Design an enzyme around this catalytic site. Structure first.
Site, PDB file in Angstrom:
ATOM      1  N   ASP E  13     -25.033 -22.843  14.289  1.00 54.01           N
ATOM      2  CA  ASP E  13     -24.658 -22.074  13.104  1.00 54.01           C
ATOM      3  C   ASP E  13     -25.337 -22.565  11.826  1.00 54.01           C
ATOM      4  O   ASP E  13     -24.802 -22.403  10.727  1.00 54.01           O
ATOM      5  CB  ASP E  13     -23.136 -22.073  12.921  1.00 54.01           C
ATOM      6  CG  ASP E  13     -22.407 -21.465  14.106  1.00 54.01           C
ATOM      7  OD1 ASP E  13     -22.609 -20.263  14.389  1.00 54.01           O
ATOM      8  OD2 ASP E  13     -21.634 -22.195  14.761  1.00 54.01           O
ATOM      9  N   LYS E  16     -30.570 -21.355  13.465  1.00 52.25           N
ATOM     10  CA  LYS E  16     -31.580 -21.515  14.508  1.00 52.25           C
ATOM     11  C   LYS E  16     -32.092 -20.179  15.050  1.00 52.25           C
ATOM     12  O   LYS E  16     -33.297 -19.927  15.066  1.00 52.25           O
ATOM     13  CB  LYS E  16     -31.012 -22.321  15.681  1.00 52.25           C
ATOM     14  CG  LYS E  16     -30.355 -23.647  15.311  1.00 52.25           C
ATOM     15  CD  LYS E  16     -29.672 -24.273  16.529  1.00 52.25           C
ATOM     16  CE  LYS E  16     -28.672 -23.305  17.157  1.00 52.25           C
ATOM     17  NZ  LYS E  16     -27.907 -23.897  18.291  1.00 52.25           N
ATOM     18  N   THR E  17     -31.170 -19.332  15.499  1.00 51.63           N
ATOM     19  CA  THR E  17     -31.524 -18.037  16.072  1.00 51.63           C
ATOM     20  C   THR E  17     -32.097 -17.044  15.059  1.00 51.63           C
ATOM     21  O   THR E  17     -32.972 -16.244  15.400  1.00 51.63           O
ATOM     22  CB  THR E  17     -30.309 -17.399  16.775  1.00 51.63           C
ATOM     23  OG1 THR E  17     -29.698 -18.369  17.634  1.00 51.63           O
ATOM     24  CG2 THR E  17     -30.745 -16.201  17.612  1.00 51.63           C
ATOM     25  N   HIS E  76     -24.561 -25.498  22.205  1.00 50.43           N
ATOM     26  CA  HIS E  76     -25.126 -26.842  22.150  1.00 50.43           C
ATOM     27  C   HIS E  76     -25.275 -27.475  23.529  1.00 50.43           C
ATOM     28  O   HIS E  76     -26.255 -28.175  23.796  1.00 50.43           O
ATOM     29  CB  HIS E  76     -24.277 -27.752  21.257  1.00 50.43           C
ATOM     30  CG  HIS E  76     -24.701 -29.190  21.294  1.00 50.43           C
ATOM     31  ND1 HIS E  76     -26.006 -29.586  21.103  1.00 50.43           N
ATOM     32  CD2 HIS E  76     -23.992 -30.323  21.516  1.00 50.43           C
ATOM     33  CE1 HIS E  76     -26.086 -30.902  21.207  1.00 50.43           C
ATOM     34  NE2 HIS E  76     -24.877 -31.373  21.457  1.00 50.43           N
TER      35      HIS E  76
HETATM   36  N1  LIG Z   1     -25.898 -18.878   3.594  1.00 54.41           N
HETATM   37  C1  LIG Z   1     -26.821 -18.867   4.612  1.00 54.41           C
HETATM   38  N2  LIG Z   1     -26.407 -18.705   5.875  1.00 54.41           N
HETATM   39  C2  LIG Z   1     -27.287 -18.702   6.927  1.00 54.41           C
HETATM   40  C3  LIG Z   1     -28.678 -18.852   6.684  1.00 54.41           C
HETATM   41  N3  LIG Z   1     -29.303 -18.807   7.890  1.00 54.41           N
HETATM   42  C4  LIG Z   1     -28.418 -18.601   8.833  1.00 54.41           C
HETATM   43  N4  LIG Z   1     -27.152 -18.538   8.295  1.00 54.41           N
HETATM   44  C5  LIG Z   1     -25.863 -18.222   8.975  1.00 54.41           C
HETATM   45  O1  LIG Z   1     -25.763 -18.955  10.235  1.00 54.41           O
HETATM   46  C6  LIG Z   1     -25.068 -18.085  11.170  1.00 54.41           C
HETATM   47  C7  LIG Z   1     -25.529 -18.249  12.622  1.00 54.41           C
HETATM   48  O2  LIG Z   1     -26.922 -18.607  12.681  1.00 54.41           O
HETATM   49  P1  LIG Z   1     -27.501 -18.856  14.155  1.00 54.41           P
HETATM   50  O3  LIG Z   1     -28.634 -19.771  13.871  1.00 54.41           O
HETATM   51  O4  LIG Z   1     -27.719 -17.418  14.841  1.00 54.41           O
HETATM   52  O5  LIG Z   1     -26.389 -19.562  15.078  1.00 54.41           O
HETATM   53  P2  LIG Z   1     -26.176 -19.656  16.677  1.00 54.41           P
HETATM   54  O6  LIG Z   1     -27.047 -18.449  17.314  1.00 54.41           O
HETATM   55  O7  LIG Z   1     -24.768 -19.441  17.040  1.00 54.41           O
HETATM   56  O8  LIG Z   1     -26.558 -21.142  17.047  1.00 54.41           O
HETATM   57  C8  LIG Z   1     -25.128 -16.602  10.717  1.00 54.41           C
HETATM   58  O9  LIG Z   1     -23.785 -16.144  10.529  1.00 54.41           O
HETATM   59  C9  LIG Z   1     -25.844 -16.699   9.326  1.00 54.41           C
HETATM   60  O10 LIG Z   1     -25.032 -16.097   8.285  1.00 54.41           O
HETATM   61  C10 LIG Z   1     -29.121 -18.995   5.315  1.00 54.41           C
HETATM   62  O11 LIG Z   1     -30.308 -19.136   5.052  1.00 54.41           O
HETATM   63  N5  LIG Z   1     -28.173 -18.997   4.313  1.00 54.41           N
END
Ligand SMILES: Nc1nc2c(ncn2[C@@H]2O[C@H](COP(=O)(O)OP(=O)(O)O)[C@@H](O)[C@H]2O)c(=O)[nH]1
Ligand SMILES: *C(=O)[C@@H](N)Cc1ccccc1
EC number: 3.6.5.3
Lengths: 82, 85, 61, 205, 375
Positions: E13, E16-17, E76
RNA sequence: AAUUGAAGAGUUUGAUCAUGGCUCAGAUUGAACGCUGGCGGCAGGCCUAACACAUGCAAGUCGAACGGUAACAGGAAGAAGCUUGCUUCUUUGCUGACGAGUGGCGGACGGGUGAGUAAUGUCUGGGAAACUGCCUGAUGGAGGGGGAUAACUACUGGAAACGGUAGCUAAUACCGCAUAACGUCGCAAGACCAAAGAGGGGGACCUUCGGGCCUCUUGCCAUCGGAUGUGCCCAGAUGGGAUUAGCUAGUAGGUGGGGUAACGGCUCACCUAGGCGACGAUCCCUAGCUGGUCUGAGAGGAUGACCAGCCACACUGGAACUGAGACACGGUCCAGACUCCUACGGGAGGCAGCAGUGGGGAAUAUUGCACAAUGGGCGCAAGCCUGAUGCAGCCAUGCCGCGUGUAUGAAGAAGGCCUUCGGGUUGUAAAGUACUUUCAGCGGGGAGGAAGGGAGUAAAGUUAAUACCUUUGCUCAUUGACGUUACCCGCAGAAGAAGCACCGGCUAACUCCGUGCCAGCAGCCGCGGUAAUACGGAGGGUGCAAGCGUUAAUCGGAAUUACUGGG
RNA sequence: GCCCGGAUAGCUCAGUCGGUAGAGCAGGGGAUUGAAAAUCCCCGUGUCCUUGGUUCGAUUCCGAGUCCGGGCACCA
């Protein structure tokens, strides 16, 4: 049914058709009653390449034997008249 | 088997049920003649002969019999009744 | 029973090999040759002449 | 196919100038002829009957440049001809195109003559012939293709034919570099020193 | 075309994705190529590697100079079974660090897992820079990553860190869009078909099908591919490619494919070997390797070794043990060195310079190595 | 123009002549292995497990047989947008064509294997007691009616497979009537038996306005023929063992009945008591046969891969229907074995078709392309189907061709090796120098395999007709998997291409060093015991060549199974 | 891919429930002879497969890999 068909002989990319009198229910190069001449479709500018003794042919078609279209067309080429 | 030439399967069953049914009636007419020949009635068999003579000959032109088998029937059957008469 | 030719081999109780006929007229009963350089039988060491037999490859260098 | 090795060493094996190195310098003199077959060549060969019969055959093969299977194929041809097997072989071996062009004088050495034939430079009946094993028919004419004509090789080679024999079973023009083959050769006019009698019985076994 | 495997690492979170969805789109519009949707990267289809259920999305982004195949894990624990087991390996990682969370313990574990398997380069992508918009707090997040890299034996003093916003790179705002190009530019500056043998399957009736995800290049059905194994190498051709029993006309870089050979048994190929390009590498019986040794508290050993010590090398899919010759000058090698060792492996295989691996012995990871010189 | 064709050597022994085996030199191979490896041309490539098999494909076709049209494209009627005919679009078998159904035809051909078979087969030569679709010859006919059934609906059982119940309609489907002949039963007289209509065009006429009528093409019925195929019979021939010597009781024959297309113990009832057997029965073992292939001077011996004819088989055993033909590879019924699905009641399936897989094994190839060509199937044709076939891919497996260059080049080098250390040899070999370039690789041209077919037009026949149809030419566009073809030209550069066995005798060609009855060599005789031309390395030479050797196999040599031609 | 058994000087085996590795069959080195038989005179010639841990100390204890043989899977 008796036909006057052909017979693929020779080699790969080098054919030599044997205008033959055979039966329709057999192989191409199978059992034949006689070979009435031959045909060289891959011939040259030599003095031969096609031989068909009409008498043997007419004796077969006169009996009730069918002729192959390829042979009959070439028969028009061998010109029985000229 | 999985082949569109499976119609020949149902074609033959339709044909065997048909053909054999014709052969059964063909045979019993021959049997009827032997009943009179067994009893020695020269008059009965004669009528029985012309009764189905055309019948056994009828399947000949139909293509069921080899036509020479049918002809062989009309020969010996006559031979029995002329032996009797 | 076969004759294992070569200068120092590596056959131990098993390991599939190949057998080609031929008597040696030196041993009573034997009539074959285990081919060096077949399936498991490795090529003999330091042999630079006549290597069609003994299964030795051509020296790289 | 070819030997491609020291093609003068085998001439020392028999101790006779087989013309394998005619070139431009006629007389060699520096090859240690007759005394350099191998390393211990000072010894006199035991020379058995099978050995004397072999060398006669081995002499000619190194001369025309053919191999055993090629030769055994050629000998079989001599068997199926009337007249005499001894001459049937030698008449056949002169039918080689690389031999014909060599005899015409368009080739210094047979090895050099073999190369011009194999590289489409030669032209018989106005037709390009690649295979040197082309059995030439009598009463035919050969010539050099125009694009590969007078390309310095045949020029030097033509004048070297003026220290040669100039046979009678063939004919040359030498005006437009043209040569015409007549009837097949007779034994009596080919080198006069190659005995074919010993060759025949070798292939009987 | 040359190819390097890349992946986004860090705390879940952090971005990454979406960063994975950021580079795939930025290199597909301004340069050209196919783009993968974010939901297509967030949801990862399953794969069975060596018997373990793995969910890894295989997306791709192309740079004018380098070819990239990306891997990702929305769990993870999924990242755990990626690098150590031998499923997913990257030569250069993109450390995703949020500016709002900074170097998290989960971010510290991804920095830790980079040490063991042997990831030589780690690009850091400071994400979430759209919230923390002050200069002071943005540099405290920079030194915490650099201190977490330097303590973990990473060249954190000269690593190019790209401060950016991943979600802003999705809609297409030029201010953060060109910054990802600086990230893609740093993937090229700071950081030949080959295929590992993960598992073989004698498909009933078809023949022998070898499984394995594509390392580099693209292959189609019909190419003549060679195979370098711990035996005398051979030649064959790929008469077919399917994925999870689903037709596939082309086997591209990154996709977990299934290659079907041309007439080979199960005994000819043993898990661990490699299908390489016919004309790039030959097998070697001798070579030199550079290794780093861990300590007792992070696994490693507690007692040194001597001459003749043969540890089990784990190079990508192979468990080849080899008697190691030590360099002159040292007798006892204590846990913690960073010296080079001589390798004379028991069975020759394609061992070129630069290949990374994690050494094991007895049942625990002892050290991380890389081939220094091929002999 | 048509077989101009036959070799020997080593080893018994102190030595010799014979007798006599053993072995070697040759040729060949459906090959395997080892090493090495440049390409091309033509064939060939599962011999063991007749072992079990995933998936794809290998036989369908005809609307010019019929009811229909579920779909796709038009026509036509209509209808809605709205640019009022630009579109949208609901009906409609009315045409083109067409899933599924009824039917004619093919499915018995083509293709694969060799398990079985010692004579029910094959080969050779004859024979009469037969049948024979498609094609063809000759002569007549082709008149007239009736009732069911599938598809299609309604309902309904079952997981599926797979049906069922009450009804609908037609036909070159089926069943009667009519009429018979040189046809069939019969000595004769007599008796009895056949069938079917469609497609195109169109004049007078005729239109219950479907169409009739004339005509052209084709199909249908019967008979004698013919060609071809198929079935049957006799004689000869076609392996080994007598340590296999008696075998057989529907067995030998006859009469009668029945059956078979046809003769017949083919099968029955009865009578008689014979039949095969040393020129070999029965039994056992093995095995497809032949035209051929290899060897051999021949006679013969061995053998029966590819190709061609024939027989047998189709998971095992058996049976039978359909049909001109099967008692059937991609057909049915049953028993059995082995797999597969399952809703557990029940069903489904057979790669010895081409590929391919497991396993076997010393070892033998792609789940390729096209129906362009030849042939086959159906059809009027067009066409459609065709793993037959034509090609391509894979392998040095064989035969065959070619290249890896040439000419020049002497301090007759370096280095290796031997040396009486003088030198010799490697060695015209190389380097250096001067030219050319097959085939590779790159880039452009370009045969031929293609005959026809389709449409159009003119003419000649057909006819009432310039129509339709058929035939002989011609015009237009052309139909090519192979295919970056065969072949040709251009460009660059010797550039990209040489190993393998052997060297005591048989048998062509040598020494040094090392190892010392050790290691190993070896086909035979035989080498090695501290100076090995035979072991191992090295230099040199020899034999052959993209092959060289090895093992197995067959013949030859072996006149050591002798008929030619022995004792 | 996973679970065990053999890996003990040339060969076959003893020895261990940590204590500085044995035996048998061997074979060979010397004296004799042209060379051996025969006789006399002396014999380990061992990385316990390798490697690591628990260490005053591991053949034997727990571990791994590799080679060999024997059982089970799984089916892009
Ligand atoms: N405020 C902010 N939030 C971010 C940014 N990049 C990603 N996020 C948040 O991170 C969350 C999940 O990102 P992700 O990398 O897809 O997580 P994962 O796929 O579960 O490991 C999303 O809800 C985005 O809102 C950013 O540059 N700024
Ligand atoms: C076959 O599906 C491979 N392409 C991917 C795979 C799936 C499961 C297990 C192993 C390989």
């Amino acid at each position: 049914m008796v036909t006057i068909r052909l017979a693929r002989h020779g080699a790969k990319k080098r054919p030599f058709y044997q205008v033959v009198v055979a039966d329709s229910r057999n192989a191409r190069n199978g059992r034949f009653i006689e070979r009435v001449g031959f045909f060289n479709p891959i011939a040259s500018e030599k003095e031969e390449g096609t031989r068909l003794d009409l008498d043997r042919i007419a004796h077969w078609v006169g009996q009730g034997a069918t002729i192959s279209d390829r042979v009959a067309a070439l028969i028009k080429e061998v010109n029985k008249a000229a | 088997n999985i082949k569109s030439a499976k119609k020949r399967a149902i074609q033959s069953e339709k044909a065997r049920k048909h053909n054999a049914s014709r052969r059964s009636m063909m045979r019993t007419f021959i049997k009827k003649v032997y009943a009179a020949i067994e009893a020695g009635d020269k008059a009965a068999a004669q009528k029985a002969f012309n009764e189905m003579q055309p019948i056994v000959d009828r399947q000949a032109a139909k293509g069921l019999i080899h036509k020479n088998k049918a002809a062989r029937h009309k020969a010996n059957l006559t031979a029995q009744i002329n032996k009797l008469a | 029973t076969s004759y294992i030719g070569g200068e120092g081999h590596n056959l131990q109780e098993h390991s599939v090999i190949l057998i080609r006929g031929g008597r040696v007229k030196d041993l009573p009963g034997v009539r074959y040759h285990t081919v060096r350089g077949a399936l498991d039988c490795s090529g003999v060491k330091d042999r630079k002449q006549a290597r069609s037999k003994y299964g030795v490859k051509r020296p790289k260098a | 196919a070819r030997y491609l090795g020291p093609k003068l060493k085998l001439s020392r094996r028999e101790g006779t100038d087989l013309f394998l190195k005619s070139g431009v310098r006629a007389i060699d003199t520096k090859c240690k002829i007759e005394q350099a077959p191998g390393q211990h060549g000072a010894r006199k060969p035991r020379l058995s009957d099978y050995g004397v019969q072999l060398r006669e055959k081995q002499k000619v093969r190194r001369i025309y440049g053919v191999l055993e299977r090629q030769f055994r194929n050629y000998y079989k041809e001599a068997a199926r001809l009337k007249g005499n097997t001894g001459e049937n072989l030698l008449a056949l071996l002169e039918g080689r195109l690389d031999n014909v062009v060599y005899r015409m004088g368009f080739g210094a050495t047979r090895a050099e003559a073999r190369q011009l034939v194999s590289h489409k430079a030669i032209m018989v009946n106005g037709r390009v012939v690649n295979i040197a094993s082309y059995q030439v028919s009598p009463n035919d004419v050969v010539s050099i293709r125009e694009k590969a004509k007078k390309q310095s090789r045949v020029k030097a080679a033509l004048e070297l034919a003026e220290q040669r024999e100039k046979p009678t079973w063939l004919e040359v023009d030498a005006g437009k570099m043209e040569g015409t083959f007549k009837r097949k050769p007779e034994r009596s006019d080919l080198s006069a020193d190659i005995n074919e009698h010993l060759i025949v019985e070798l292939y009987s076994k | 075309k040359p190819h390097v495997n890349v992946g986004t690492i860090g705390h879940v979170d952090h971005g990454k994705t979406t960063l994975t969805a950021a580079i795939t789109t930025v290199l597909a519009k301004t340069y050209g190529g196919a783009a993968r949707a974010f939901d297509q990267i967030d949801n990862a289809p399953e794969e069975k590697a060596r018997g373990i259920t793995i969910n890894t999305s295989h997306v791709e982004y192309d740079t004018p100079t380098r070819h990239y195949a990306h891997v990702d894990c929305p769990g993870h624990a999924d990242y755990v079974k990626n690098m150590i087991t031998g499923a997913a390996q990257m030569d250069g990682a993109i450390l995703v660090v949020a500016a709002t969370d900074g170097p998290m313990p989960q971010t510290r574990e991804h920095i830790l897992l980079g040490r063991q398997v042997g990831v030589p380069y780690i690009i850091v992508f400071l994400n979430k820079c759209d919230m923390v918009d002050d200069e002071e707090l943005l540099e405290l997040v920079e030194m915490e990553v650099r201190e977490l890299l330097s303590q973990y034996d990473f060249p954190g003093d000269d690593t190019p860190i790209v401060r950016g916003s991943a979600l802003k790179a999705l809609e297409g705002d030029a201010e953060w869009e060109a910054k990802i190009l600086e990230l893609a530019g740093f993937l090229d500056s700071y950081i030949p078909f080959l295929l590992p043998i993960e598992d073989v399957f004698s498909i009933s009736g078809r023949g022998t099908v070898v499984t394995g995800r594509v390392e580099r290049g693209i292959i189609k059905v019909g190419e003549e591919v060679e195979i370098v194994g711990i035996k005398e190498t051979q030649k064959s051709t790929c008469t077919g490619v399917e994925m999870f029993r689903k037709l596939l006309d082309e086997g591209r870089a990154g996709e977990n494919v299934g290659v079907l050979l041309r007439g080979i048994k199960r005994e000819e190929i043993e898990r661990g070997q490699v299908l390489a390009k016919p004309g790039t590498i030959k097998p070697h019986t001798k070579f030199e390797s550079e290794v780093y040794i861990l300590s007792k508290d992070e696994g490693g050993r507690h007692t040194p070794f001597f001459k003749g010590y043969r540890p089990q090398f784990y190079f990508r899919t192979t468990d080849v043990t080899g008697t190691i010759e030590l360099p002159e000058g040292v007798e006892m090698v204590m846990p913690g060195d960073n010296i080079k060792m001589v390798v004379t492996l028991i069975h020759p295989i394609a061992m070129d310079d630069g290949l990374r691996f994690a050494i094991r012995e007895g049942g625990r990871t002892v050290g991380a190595g890389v081939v220094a010189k091929v002999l």
